[PDB]
A paper describes a structure:
[name] is the central eukaryotic recombinase required for meiotic recombination and mitotic repair of double-strand DNA breaks (DSBs). Here we report the cryo-electron microscopy structures of human [name]–nucleosome complexes, in which [name] forms ring and filament conformations. We found that [name] forms multiple conformations in the complex with the nucleosome, such as ring forms with eight (octameric), nine (nonameric) or ten (decameric) protomers, and a filament form. Notably, we found that in all [name]–nucleosome complexes, the NLDs of [name] directly bind to the DNA wrapped in the nucleosome.
The nonameric [name] ring form is detected in either the presence of ATP or AMP-PNP or the absence of nucleotide cofactors. The [name] ring forms bind to the nucleosomal DNA and incorporate the linker DNA into the central hole of the ring. In the ring forms, the N-terminal lobe domains (NLDs) of [name] protomers are aligned on the outside of the [name] ring, and directly bind to the nucleosomal DNA. The nucleosomal linker DNA that contains the [name] site is recognized by the L1 and L2 loops—active centres that face the central hole of the [name] ring. The spatial arrangements of the [name] octameric (or nonameric) and decameric rings relative to the nucleosome are distinct. Accordingly, different [name] protomers recognize the DNA end by the L1 loops in the central hole of the ring. In the octameric and nonameric [name] rings, the L1 loops of protomers 5 and 6 bind to the DNA end. DNA end binding by [name] rings is commonly observed among the octameric, nonameric and decameric rings complexed with the nucleosome. In our cryo-EM analysis, the [name] NLDs aligned on the periphery of the [name] ring bind to the nucleosomal DNA, anchor the [name] ring near the linker DNA and facilitate the targeting of a dsDNA–ssDNA junction by the [name] L1 loop. As compared to the [name] filament form, the [name] ring binds to the nucleosome without drastic structural changes of the nucleosome, such as DNA peeling from the histones.
Residue numbers in the entry:
A (entry chain A): 38 to 133
B (entry chain E): 36 to 134
C (entry chain B): 25 to 101
D (entry chain F): 16 to 102
E (entry chain G): 15 to 118
F (entry chain C): 11 to 118
G (entry chain D): 32 to 123
H (entry chain H): 33 to 123
The structure:
Amino acid sequence: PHRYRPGTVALREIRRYQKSTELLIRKLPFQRLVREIAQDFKTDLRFQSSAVMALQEACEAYLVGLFEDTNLCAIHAKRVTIMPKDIQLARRIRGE
Amino acid sequence: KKPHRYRPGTVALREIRRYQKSTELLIRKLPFQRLVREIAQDFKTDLRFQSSAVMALQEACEAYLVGLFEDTNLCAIHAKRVTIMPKDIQLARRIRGER
Amino acid sequence: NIQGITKPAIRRLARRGGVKRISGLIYEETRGVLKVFLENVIRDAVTYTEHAKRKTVTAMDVVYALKRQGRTLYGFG
Amino acid sequence: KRHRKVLRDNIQGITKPAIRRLARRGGVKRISGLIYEETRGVLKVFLENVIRDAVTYTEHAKRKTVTAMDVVYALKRQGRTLYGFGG
Amino acid sequence: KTRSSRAGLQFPVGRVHRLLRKGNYSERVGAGAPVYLAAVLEYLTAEILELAGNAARDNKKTRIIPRHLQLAIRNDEELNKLLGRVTIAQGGVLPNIQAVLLPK
Amino acid sequence: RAKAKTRSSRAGLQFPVGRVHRLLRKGNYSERVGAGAPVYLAAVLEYLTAEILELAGNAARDNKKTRIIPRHLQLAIRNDEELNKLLGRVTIAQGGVLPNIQAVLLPK
Amino acid sequence: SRKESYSIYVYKVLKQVHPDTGISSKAMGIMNSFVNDIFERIAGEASRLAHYNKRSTITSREIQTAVRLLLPGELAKHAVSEGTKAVTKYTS
Amino acid sequence: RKESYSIYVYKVLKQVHPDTGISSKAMGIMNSFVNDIFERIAGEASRLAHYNKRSTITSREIQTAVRLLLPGELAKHAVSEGTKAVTKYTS
């Protein structure tokens, strides 16, 4: 059987997902999470559909930016694998 | 007998303690003023400056640099080094969003 | 419900971020970060809803919340 | 009508020991020789942006003297609010 | 005759004036201020649409879509600076792989 | 005419309600200003002032100083998580920084 | 040349909380900068609140919502408590 | 009802790219953009007026605000367009 080396498919996926723009998290679980979190501030709230889509765009854009910075931090330490300490460094420098 | 000579790093650490305890400005007043006036001259000639304006600018510059060095140090330590290098500064400024 | 943000989804997001190899411990950490972010935004969003004495969070509420945290979003006006 | 000596090479007034002292306040223990030029460049960029904005305010008021308030506003609008120079 | 027509503009000067009057910005509004503002907004709109059209043509599409706007903005240093903290929904990101990740 | 009572006194406050009202009227924030709004605002400003002064006094006594100086204000602000969050982007002139050495730099 | 500041009120509060503590001139200036900063932030946020809801009057309700937006957690709860108590005592 | 800049965006588009269209979402994004820059400029102008104790916002305040917000070449070109427009309008 044929087998691609580790990394080739990863790179293919990088090109694939940087070429397109569709949302990458499933709609319904995301909505469920949003409603659960909202429930802890005020009961019985409802949501307009476009509000949830807006929140999803914001969340995914935020995470993508965080992963770019995380990758730069990983490469700085001459590694290619991102680790939790990389995320924590990135978040400390952003000021969160 | 051999002259007294502390090992590399001792005096650096003592200086860290010393300068974190105090608050006085660390750059000489007059060269800084000349720098400001030179830079200012490339936008409009013959400007004058109030003294307190220059002192304010100096506070801002030194605070900015101090923060940059904190982040630079964290970036250096992340790479398991103890010496800060230019690539550390460039990483810090890239993540802040200035470049 | 935090588990609905699945491992392959986070992998896809990381792919868009250019990440080639990912330690197993990243996923839980990412989830925590996400939760914090969401909380803050939603906390503000519901506040606007409450100020208007409404029970339905609108898209405009979210846009204002995001704007005041310096993360201006285009497309939902 | 007796102007000062034309300003040149003033970036060299930011001496090596001064930058070292600043680094000490930042907790840096060891410093590569190449750090100094980089620091000078960064500082220069920062200064340019601030002074540009300050002078813009000065010109809007049709004044020829940059005031402390001009600087405070310039810094404020760049998200680096400075306390201590009001009034 | 409209003020926009006298000013050679496409953006609605009158509407901008009304929005300034009702935006609680100042007690009075000069006659030239909305003209100037409208001109600036039209110029910037033209710049963004220029670049987005170029990006659309590279992609052999006849309609500008959000993807083209994101590509146009991020590929221009001054626009990218201006919109450094703006998220374009359905914009994606610029194609970009760090050199160290490629083989060899 | 009735004896003059100040609104600050009616509210049990130290901060000047009248002045805050005038600044709201002349700050072009809204066309109209309710009678209760400046009282609330004054109370919040007074409370926050009290909180900062509380921490700064504590710091002053810890340093065996009887007069609060800017150094004490900087120490007070950076050592309190919520104030540090609120003033995350503020520079205190003559404040310095918190004493802090990364553990990896100390000798073994 | 009359320049208003919060100096006398800051001094009264200081005497309430630390009877034997003083303050340098620079620190009082810093306090004035601080007070003006928080004032501007709150008034501006309140203005935006009023604008979003097409109301022409800023009332104590807008102040309260703005306070909840700007201050974190327990600081916000305590400030809200103080404001509410103060307004209710004033109203009577 | 609900105002937008759509028709003006379309006129500009026809000036710069006669054969190019635009999706509904892209037009919405353009409207968000225009409103954003509007708010920024008006707010900066407001602070300018307050700092100088002037009660009138004039074209000069607009110009200074433009110089503060836009970087470099964008600022210069914007100033050029503003000046030409005010000069053509005045006569």
